[PDB]
Structure 1
Amino acid sequence: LKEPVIVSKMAARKKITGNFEFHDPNALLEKLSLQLGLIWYFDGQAIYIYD
C-alpha cells in the first residue's frame, strides 16, 4: 500500500488465516472490506480502518 495503516481496537479483535497475494492492494482492500464488514478511508497520508 505504501502508506501507514491505523486499525481500530474493535476491528483488531477479528482474526484471519490463509495464503494471500498483494498484486493490487486497493482492490484487495475493497473485497475484504465487504467480506469482513470493515469500513475504511484515506486522507492522503494514512489509511484508517474501522468496524
Structure 2
Amino acid sequence: GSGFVAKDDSLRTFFDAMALQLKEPVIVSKMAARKKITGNFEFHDPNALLEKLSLQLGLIWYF
C-alpha cells in the first residue's frame, strides 16, 4: 500500500520520504549526506526500520 522505490538516492532525498510515516521532519547532516542507497523499501513499521538501517548503514540519530 505504501513504500519508496530508491534508485541511487543520497540519504537526504531518502529520509525525507520517511518524514510522513514518521510524524516529525528529519534533518540529515552534510557528512552523512554522501552515502547512497538503492532498493525497494516499505514503510510499515518505521521506528524499527530506522533503527535497523542506522546500524547497518552506520548512523546515529536523536529525537
The CA deviation at 1:2 is 1.2
Misfit runs of 4+, over 6 Å? none
Structure-1 separation of matches of 2:46 and 2:30: 22
User: What TM-score results when the alignment is normalised by the length of structure 2?
Assistant: 0.65
Cα RMSD over matched residues?
0.4
Question: Percent identity between the aligned chains?
Answer: 100
The one of the two structures with greater contact order (alpha-carbon pairs below 8 A, sep at least 6) is 1
Structure 1 runs not aligned, ≥5 long = 43-51
How many residues were matched structurally?
A: 42
For residues 31 and 46 of structure 2, the distance between their equivalents in structure 1, rounded to whole angstroms, comes to 22
Q: Structure 2 regions of 5+ residues with no counterpart?
A: 1-21
Structure with greater strand share of residues: 1
The normalised TM-score by structure 1 is: 0.80
User: Residue 47 of structure 2 aligns to a residue in which SS?
Assistant: helix
